[PDB]
Structure 1
Amino acid sequence: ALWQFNGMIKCKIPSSEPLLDFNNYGCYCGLGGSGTPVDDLDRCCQTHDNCYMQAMKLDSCKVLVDNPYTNNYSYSCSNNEITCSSENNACEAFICNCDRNAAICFSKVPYNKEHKNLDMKNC
């Protein structure tokens, strides 16, 4: 769920408020996403979007009433490392992995302020 994804990004980027810093950035970071990613950070968000789309395709995710944004899973942050839990069932585990991979991706790419609150004409 979004609560967990927020904590994961803070795990990798302890100075950030991720639901502010990484929402409405580029063509992909935030609800929806279309067009060509504007930079590597925006590409991290495109990959994450694709990951959530694949999660919705899984037989195990079709059995729950809640989407990737509201589906709670278990993970830990320790020494700024993210670990998804073996106690997660299949859908939860898949979403946990999407989130972990994106949090790590965000931490490894430049942040370009010119792409924050991007005009949708660009997408």
Structure 2
Amino acid sequence: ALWQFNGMIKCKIPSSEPLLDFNNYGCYCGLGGSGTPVDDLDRCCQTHDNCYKQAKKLDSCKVLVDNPYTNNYSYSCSNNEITCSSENNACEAFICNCDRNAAICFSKVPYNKEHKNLDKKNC
């Protein structure tokens, strides 16, 4: 869910306030996402959006009537390193991986301020 994701981002980027920093960035970071990603950080978000769509097609998630946005998986942050819990079931594990991959991605690409709060006409 959002609480875990926010925590994962802070794990990899300790200087960030993810809800302030990564929400509403480019064409994909935030609600929705369409068009061509504006930069590499936007591409991280596009991949994450796609990862959530995929999660909805997994049989384990479907039988559980799961929602990636509210999924209650467990993870731990140790020395800026994220670990998805082994106790997570197949569906929770997949979603945890989507979140971990995105958090790592965010930490490896440049942040371009001019792409914050992009008017979607550009998407």
Shift of 1:27: 0.2
- The superposition leaves residues 67-90 of structure 1 with CA deviations (integer Å, 9 ceiling, x where unpaired) of 111111011000000001110001
Unpaired segments ≥5 residues, structure 1: none
Name segments (4+ residues, structure 1) moved above 3 Å: none
The aligned counterpart of 1:41 is: 41
* CA-CA distance at 1:122 after TM superposition: 0.5
Structure 1 distance, partners of 2:73, 2:19, is 18
Structure 1 residue 19, shift from structure 2 partner: 1.4
Q: Percent identity over the alignment?
A: 98
**CA deviation string 1:39-86 (max 9, x = no partner):** 000000000000000000001111234411111101100000000111
CA RMSD of aligned residues (A): 0.8
Counterpart CA distance in 2 for 1:79 and 1:53 is 30
Shift, 1:102, TM fit: 0.2
For residues 118 and 94 of structure 2, the distance between their equivalents in structure 1, rounded to whole angstroms, comes to: 30
What's the TM-score, normalizing by structure 2?
A: 0.97
- Larger displacement relative to structure 2 (100-109 or 14-23): 14-23
Structure 1 stretch 29-38 or stretch 58-67: which is displaced more? 58-67
Shift of 1:121: 0.6
Shift of 1:31: 1.1
Paired residue total: 123
Which of 54-63 and 34-43 deviates more? 54-63
SS for the counterpart of 2:114 is helix
Mean CA deviation greater in 55-64 or 80-89: 55-64
Matched, 1:88 2:88: yes
